[PDB]
C-alpha cells in the first residue's frame, strides 16, 4: 500500500486520457472536413442534373428531391454530431500563474520513468536548466504537454535505447526538446507496454501537412498555441531520429 | 494527528480529473459512433434514388448519366471514408479491453461516494442518500473501469440535480447480476446554469437533454455503457427531461 504511487498512477492515467481526449477532437475535426468533400461532390453533380431537368414531370422531381434530402440529412448529421461537440472547446482556455520550472521538469521526468519508460527499458538522459527559473503559464497544461511529448518519444523507442530531454530557458522562451530514435516495430508491438492505443501509435506514422502534428501530440500543439508558443516535431518513420520541440514565452 | 478515513484530497482531485477526461473521451467516441451508424441510411436512400433516376433518364442525353455517375461516385466515396475517419479512431473503446479480478465492493462504493461528494455534490448542495450492501460482497470485474462507471453515473445524476435535491444510490445482487441504481430529479435549469459548478462541459449537459432513440444513452454516459457491455452486462437509463425522475442502472455479472 503506497498512496504516493497511487497518486502517480492516477496522474499518468489522467494525462493519457487528456492526450486521447485531444486526439478525439482532431478525429472529429478531420471527420467533419473529410466527409464534406463527397457531400460537396454529390451536391454539385446533383445541381448539374437539377439545371438540365427544370422541365421535369413529377416523378423526376420527386427522385431529385430524394437525392437532395439524402445530402441535407448528411449535412445536418455532421452539424449535429461532429461539429456541435466542439462548439466551445475549439479555443483552449488556460490559467497562467508563476511556477518553478525545474520541479515540474523533475516531476515530469519521474512520472514518465514510473509510468512507462522503466518498464520499456528506455533510458531518459535529462539536461535541465540550472538555477531556479520560473514561468508564468498554466502549470497543469504544461505538465500534460511535457508528459505527452516525452511519453510519445518513449513509445517510439526500442528497449535499450535512450531518449534525450533537454530544456532551456533564457529571457525570451522556455524550450523543451525531446529526441528519440524511432523503432516502428516497438511502437506497434502488442506485447510491449503502451500508454496510448494502437490507432494513436499507427496514426503517428502517417505523413501530414507542415502545419500539422501527429494526433497523439494534439494536446501539445493546442497547449503551446494557448500560451502563445509553438510545438513541432519531425515526421515519425522507422529508423529516424526525431526531435519534438515545445516553446512557450517566459 | 489526524486519522485518515478516505483517500487523500490530492488523490481525489487527480481521480476526478482522470475520470472526467475518460467520460469526455467516451463521449467523443459516441459522437463518432453515432455519425458512423446514421450516415448509412441517407447513403442507402440516395443509392436507391440514383437507380430510379438512372432508369427514368435511360434514353436522355448521356451527360445526364454522367452527372448520375458523379453522384454515385460521391456516395461510394462517402461509404469508403466511414471506416477510416469514424470507425478506426474509436476502435478501442468500441471493444473496451478490461481485466477482471476479485475485489471487495463496499470499499469501492465508499471511495466513489467520497469522490463525488468532494468533487461536485457538496459544492452543489446535493445529498447522495446511499444504501450500502450488507455483508462483505465481492465482485470479479475491472475495478478501475467500474469505479469510472459508478463515478460517471453518480456525477451525471448530481449534474441533473438542483440545490437541496437528492440522489439515491443503492446496490443489489439480483441473481447472478450485481446492479447499482442511481435515482435523481432532473432540473434542466441546474444542468445549464454556468454560475453552478460542473464536472462535464456545457455540450455534454446540453446533449443529455436531447431526444434520442431509447437504445441510445446520453453521450456523457457512454463510458458506463461500454464498461457494462465489456463485462457482459447492461446499462439502462430513462431520458433526461426537466421535472422527470430518472433512474440509471448499471448491471454486471458478479462472477467474471
Ligand atoms: Co478542404
Q: Where are the domains of chain B?
A: 29-94, 101-253
Which of B19, B30, B49 should we substitute to test contact with A (largest number of A Cβ atoms within 10 Å)?
B49
Chain A, chain B: beta-carbon pairs less than 8 Å apart: 161
Q: Sign (positive/negative) of CA torsion B4, B9, B15, B16?
A: positive
Separation of CA B45 and ligand 1 centre (Å) = 26
The closest alpha carbon to A30, from A68, A75, A78, belongs to: A78
H-assigned helices in B121-200? 122-124, 143-159, 188-192
Separation of CA A26 and ligand 1 centre (Å) = 15
Contact A172, A195 (CB under 8 A): no
User: HSE on the CB side for B93, CA within 13 Å?
Assistant: 28
The closest alpha carbon to A205, from A162, A160, A239, belongs to: A239
Which residues of chain A does B77 touch, with a Cβ-Cβ cutoff of 8 Å? 37-38, 41
Q: Sign (positive/negative) of CA torsion B117, B120, B123, B128?
A: negative
Which residues of chain B does A25 touch, with a Cβ-Cβ cutoff of 8 Å? 28
Gap between the Cα atoms of A113 and A150, Å rounded? 10
- Contact partners, residue A193, CB within 8 Å, separation at least 6: A116, A119, A120
Gap between the Cα atoms of A208 and A211, Å rounded? 8
**Rounded to 5 degrees, what are φ and ψ at B85?**
-100, -20
A240/B contact by beta carbon, under 8 A: no
CB–CB of B203 and A89 under 8 A? yes
The closest alpha carbon to A150, from A164, A168, A133, belongs to: A164
Gap between the Cα atoms of A20 and A219, Å rounded? 9
Gap between the Cα atoms of A49 and B61, Å rounded? 11
Map chain A to HEC letters.
CCHHHHHHHHHHHHHHHHHHHHHHHHHHHHHHHHHHHHHHHHHHHHHHHHHHCCCCCHHHHHHHHHHHHHHHHHHHHHHHHHHHHHCCCCCCCCCCEEEEHHHHHHHHHHHHHHHHHCCCCCEEEEECCCCCCEEEECHHHHHHHHHHHHHHHHHCCCCCCEEEEEEEECCCEEEEEEEEECCHHHHHCCCCCCCCCHHHHHHCCCCCCCCCCCHHHHHHHHHHHHCCCEEEECCCCCCCEEEEEEEEEC
Contact A46, B71 (CB under 8 A): yes
**Rounded to 5 degrees, what are φ and ψ at B212?**
-135, 175
Residue of B nearest to A12 (CA): B18
Q: Indicate the SS3 state at residue B180.
A: strand
Gap between the Cα atoms of A245 and A243, Å rounded? 6
DSSP-derived secondary structure letter, B219 = G
Residue of A nearest to B8 (CA): A3
Contact B142, B227 (CB under 8 A): yes
Look at the domain A97-249 and name its fold.
Heat Shock Protein 90 (3.30.565)
Gap between the Cα atoms of B104 and B12, Å rounded? 19
Gap between the Cα atoms of A82 and B35, Å rounded? 7
The closest alpha carbon to B30, from A24, A79, A197, belongs to: A24
Contact B29, B90 (CB under 8 A): yes
CB–CB of B21 and A14 under 8 A? yes
Within 45-104 of B, beta carbons closer than 8 Å to A belong to: 45-46, 48-50, 52-53, 56-57, 61, 63-64, 67-68, 70-71, 73-75, 77-78, 81, 85-86, 88-92
How far apart, in Å, do the first and last CA atoms of chain A sit?
40
Gap between the Cα atoms of A177 and A234, Å rounded? 12
Residue of A nearest to B93 (CA): A197
Q: Sign (positive/negative) of CA torsion B81, B83, B87, B89?
A: negative
Gap between the Cα atoms of A97 and A91, Å rounded? 19
Contact A113, A125 (CB under 8 A): no
Q: Would you tell me how many other CB atoms lie within 10 Å of the CB of residue A156?
A: 26
CA B236 to chain centre: 10
Question: Cell numbers at residue A233, please?
Answer: 516535431
Contact B154, B247 (CB under 8 A): no
CB–CB of B67 and A45 under 8 A? yes
Task: Tell how strand A134-137 and strand A162-169 pair up.
Answer: unpaired
Q: To the nearest 10°, the Cα dihedral for B81, A236, A197, B217?
A: -40
Q: Would you tell me how many other CB atoms lie within 10 Å of the CB of residue A152?
A: 29
Gap between the Cα atoms of B57 and B42, Å rounded? 22
The closest alpha carbon to B87, from A189, A83, A190, A31, belongs to: A31
Question: Cell numbers at residue A104, please?
Answer: 515540474
CB–CB of A34 and B203 under 8 A? no
CATH of domain B101-253: 3.30.565.10
H-assigned helices in B135-243? 143-159, 188-192, 202-209, 222-230
Amino acid at each position: 500500500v503506497d498512496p504516493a504511487a497511487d497518486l502517480l498512477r492516477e496522474r499518468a492515467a489522467h494525462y493519457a486520457a487528456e492526450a486521447a481526449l485531444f486526439l478525439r477532437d482532431q478525429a472529429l475535426s478531420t471527420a467533419s472536413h473529410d466527409l464534406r468533400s463527397p457531400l460537396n461532390a454529390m451536391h454539385s453533380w446533383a445541381y448539374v442534373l437539377e439545371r438540365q431537368l427544370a422541365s421535369a414531370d413529377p416523378s423526376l422531381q420527386r427522385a431529385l428531391a430524394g437525392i437532395r434530402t439524402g445530402i441535407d440529412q448528411q449535412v445536418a448529421l455532421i452539424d449535429d454530431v461532429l461539429d456541435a461537440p466542439r462548439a466551445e472547446t475549439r479555443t483552449l482556455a488556460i490559467t497562467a500563474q508563476p511556477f518553478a520550472l525545474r520541479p515540474l521538469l523533475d516531476d515530469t521526468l519521474a512520472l514518465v520513468r514510473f509510468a512507462l519508460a522503466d518498464a520499456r527499458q528506455v533510458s531518459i538522459d535529462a539536461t535541465l536548466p540550472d538555477g531556479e527559473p520560473s514561468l508564468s503559464a498554466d502549470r497543469e497544461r504544461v505538465a500534460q504537454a511535457l508528459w505527452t511529448m516525452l511519453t510519445t518519444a518513449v513509445e517510439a523507442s526500442a528497449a535499450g535505447n535512450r531518449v534525450t530531454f533537454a530544456c532551456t530557458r533564457d529571457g525570451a522562451q522556455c524550450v523543451a526538446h525531446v529526441t528519440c530514435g524511432v523503432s516502428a516495430a516497438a511502437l506497434a508491438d502488442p506485447a510491449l507496454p503502451h500508454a496510448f492505443d494502437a490507432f494513436a501509435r499507427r496514426e503517428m506514422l502517417r505523413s501530414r501537412d507542415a502545419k500539422r502534428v501527429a494526433w497523439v501530440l494534439a494536446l501539445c500543439q493546442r497547449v503551446a498555441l494557448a500560451h502563445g508558443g509553438t510545438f513541432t516535431h519531425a515526421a515519425f518513420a522507422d529508423g529516424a531520429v526525431v526531435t519534438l520541440s515545445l516553446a512557450v514565452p517566459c
